[PDB]
């Protein structure tokens, strides 16, 4: 709901922020274009 607001470190290590407005993993959340933050590492 406010991940982008807590960027570039909205969540902890291991998870990535999805443009949809939610953290997660894999490509769905940490994919090229489908990630708002935590895409580089």
Swiss-Prot record:
The Chitin-binding type-1 domain sits at 4-41
Which Gene3D superfamilies did the record assign?
Endochitinase-like
The GO molecular function terms of this record are: chitin binding
Which of the residues bear the PTM Pyrrolidone carboxylic acid?
A: 1
Q: What is an annotated GO biological process for this record, any one? A: killing of cells of another organism
Which UniProt keywords are listed?
Antimicrobial, Chitin-binding, Disulfide bond, Fungicide, Plant defense, Pyrrolidone carboxylic acid
Disulfide bond entries:
3-17, 7-37, 11-23, 16-30, 35-39
Under SMART domains, the record lists: ChtBD1 (SM00270)
What range does the record give for the signal peptide? none
Q: Which SUPFAM superfamilies match?
A: Plant lectins/antimicrobial peptides
Record's function text:
Has antifungal activity against P.infestans, A.lycopersici, V.dahliae, G.zeae, A.nicotianae, F.moniliforme, F.oxysporum and C.gossypii.
Name used for this protein in its record: Antifungal peptide 2
Species this chain originates from: Eucommia ulmoides
At the highest ranks, the source species' classification is: Eukaryota, Viridiplantae, Streptophyta, Embryophyta, Tracheophyta
